[PDB]
Amino acid sequence: TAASLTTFNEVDMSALIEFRNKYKDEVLKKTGVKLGFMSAFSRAVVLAIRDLPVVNASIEGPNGGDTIVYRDYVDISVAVATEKGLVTPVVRNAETMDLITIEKTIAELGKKARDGKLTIEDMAGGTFTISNGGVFGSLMGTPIINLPQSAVLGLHAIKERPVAVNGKVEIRPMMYLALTYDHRLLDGREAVQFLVKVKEYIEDPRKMLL
Amino acid sequence: EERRVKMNRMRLRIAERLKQSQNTAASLTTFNEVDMSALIEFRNKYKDEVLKKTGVKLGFMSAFSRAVVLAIRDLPVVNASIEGPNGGDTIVYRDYVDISVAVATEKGLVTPVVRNAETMDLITIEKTIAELGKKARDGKLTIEDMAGGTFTISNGGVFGSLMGTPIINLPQSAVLGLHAIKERPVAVNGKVEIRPMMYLALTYDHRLLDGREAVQFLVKVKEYIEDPRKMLL
Amino acid sequence: EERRVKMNRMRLRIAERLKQSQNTAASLTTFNEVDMSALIEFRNKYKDEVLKKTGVKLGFMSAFSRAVVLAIRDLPVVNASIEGPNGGDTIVYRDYVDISVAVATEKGLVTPVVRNAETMDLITIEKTIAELGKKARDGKLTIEDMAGGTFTISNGGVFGSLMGTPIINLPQSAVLGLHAIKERPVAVNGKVEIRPMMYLALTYDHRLLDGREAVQFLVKVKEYIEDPRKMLL
Amino acid sequence: EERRVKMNRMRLRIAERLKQSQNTAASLTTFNEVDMSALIEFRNKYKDEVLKKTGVKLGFMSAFSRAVVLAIRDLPVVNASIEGPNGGDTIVYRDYVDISVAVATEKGLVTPVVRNAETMDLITIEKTIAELGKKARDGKLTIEDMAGGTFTISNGGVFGSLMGTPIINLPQSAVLGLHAIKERPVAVNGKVEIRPMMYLALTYDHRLLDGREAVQFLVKVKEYIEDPRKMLL
């Protein structure tokens, strides 16, 4: 019930690594949260949805008389491993919140997942989805949609590979990406600019600062 | 050899209020050095980007105002004010920041405050700065556009300044100073090379500030400016 | 958006006495640059040595206080004081020096003076500094431990300061400023290399100091600090 | 341990007039950096030349006074003065400049003004400086040699000063500061090398100056000093 199409891209990630380590120790001293990549990816996703609203759409019509939605609020769903398998508790409205509170709520969901208190309503809903396959040894892959959602991003275990940056070849820790469309909503155009904008935000967070 | 010239009302009033802003507030100034190259590259690249996208001129003042907002958010004594009538004071602590910026004009210096800027990013800061600038070039700035204000950022960088001691804007409590970034030798990462660094200033109100709060204020502003990634947190 | 908070008695009194310490004393500030590497090596080696021997933490403040004592000994106008009641003044010249040091605390800044320090070496200076520090951490400092004082050394170096304008501590006449030694390029012996130098400050009382006495005071302190062998004389 | 010593009339009067020169004038200080090697080579070569020719000692103060005269000529607000009796002010604009220089003596600091110096070159400036110096060494300077004066150049360079905040000489409006040129690393023409640069100061009267006029004043003085060929225009 959803035309799935996947697109990949390559993103250099060294700046994110140095940023994350230095201000991870800084923020652990200050507030006490573990800075990670998922907060940056979620924030870039939020911005790229803010500048293109068709990703948060949804075909809720009962197979006919559809009522395509456009929503300002984003309820990004993250994945945490558990004994049952994969658990996807959504964060609440995250269109207006920074990296620090994103990481705080991610840690909250993680601790609520490790010791099981996650009830049904913590999994219901959700407009976007970020699935981390990076903890494993993945390189690329085709994710699935989470109907009635419309897109799903994929994180793929950043690795050291040769690059053609600034006219020379050297090793940089780059990373692959994925985006499963719903081509009855996305047109390859909106999704490709979505993913490339996420990529350029990730390449340097200074762009995300705007 | 000397001509007899009177003055205008605004000159007398600014003289009186400037003298009042010095005998009722203990003024202390602190300086620091900040490397600024990262801000320059950021500003040029995403200045052309943002001019293409929205149509505003990215500049340093937006970054400085945002760093000031964050450093006030993590220390609330800078936005304080002794409003008590010389006695029975009622020191204020305010969440909203109404940073006042300075724009040159024919009358002299004009300081129209921006409204609540605690919750707004660089882009809208630059947008409202440009709005105030155009309202200053063609004069439509009424009285209420100058009234109020909790902080103040004064740009002496357009001129050829290097350092200097600013004044307070009573009933304010602190004033930052921008001082015309210049290329000077640096002792960075064990080597000496030319980097475009910049000086800073902060005029305290030592009956409110203690050198401690103001010095951490200024050093936090400095470290935010050195790399905006820190300001991103 | 703003809360109504009163104050405490000590805040009102410090505000009043700080304003009084500015409208009754002409304050002028001078800066200088001092290389500090020799002090660093001296301090680390004989800090471990003296911790083994007597059990005190060797630091820079002892060296600065001793240099201040010597430079006052060779110029007696710094320890002066205008004690006359606004008229019929009786300018003082005193052989004893009662240097006041600053220690941070929960109340804010605490300035307990050391007693007569004109005749005592670095080791006992550090010992009494540690004594005052422990008496400040666990509060036993009574009123008489803060009363009096002829000079004042304020450490803003623990923070991230670079320079700044200190205030006088009326009825005192001068205040030194320590400003967080940093690695900066130097033009020493015809070459440029990184050395950990440091800034300084001196708030005059220009109705007593003339810029001449204070400038030779500060330059003599600087040259004593550059190599303690000079202080040995 | 302390002796009872009274004062003299001139000490009381200088204290009173120095306090008056601070509570009736908003004082603000600005600094800048100026390379000075060209002045050094110029001064030595044509100092021996002019000692052979006319018999005067070429020095830096003549060049600084001439640059000050030119920069006042291109901006007339520095020679202003608020002579109004606390009200109904009559701000002055004067073509003639009566720069006051400072010479050390047994009494302390002596500031005899030179007469109209808007139309006179470096040679006669040095000649009148030497005349004032010899009249100061053997005391013949009467009262009228100290009265008046519109500007003031204070030399703290003979001492070991690096920077500092000068005072105004009310009813004057600005004071320059010379600060003992030193060898420091520079970021000139893309490379780092040792050049004998120098700091500067300018104490405003902010009820007359606006930071704008004073900053262009000081930067123009700086650029004139950097190469006297500009002063030749």
Residue numbers in the entry:
A (entry chain A): 211 to 420
B (entry chain A), C (entry chain A), D (entry chain A): 188 to 420
What do the authors report?
We further report the high-resolution cryo-EM structure of the OGDHc core (E2o), which displays various structural adaptations. The EM map displays higher-order structural features, e.g., inter-, and intra- trimeric interfaces, captures secondary structure elements and accurately places amino-acid side chains. We were able to identify the E2o’s catalytic active site and fully model side-chain conformations of the amino-acids participating in CoA binding which are conserved across oxo-acid dehydrogenases. F247 has an outward-facing orientation to accommodate the CoA, interacting and stabilizing the CoA 3’,5’-adenosine diphosphate group via π-stacking. The limited presence of electron density for the CoA pantoic acid, β-alanine, and cysteamine components underlies the inherent flexibility of endogenously bound coenzyme A with implications for function. A major difference lies in the fact that, compared to bacterial PDHc, which could be trapped in a proposed resting state with all LDs bound to the E2 active sites, the present eukaryotic OGDHc highlights an alternative resting state where LDs are sub-stoichiometrically and transiently interacting with the E2 core. By contrast, in C. thermophilum this element obtains a β-strand (E188-M194) conformation which, along with a β-hairpin motif of residues N266 - D282 creates an extended β-sheet. This adaptation contributes to the stabilization of the core via extensive hydrogen bonding and affects subunit inter-communication in the higher-order state of the 24-meric cubic E2o core. In line with this notion, C. thermophilum intra- and inter-subunit interfaces are 1.7 and 1.5 times larger than the corresponding interfaces of the human E2o core and include extensive charge-charge interactions.
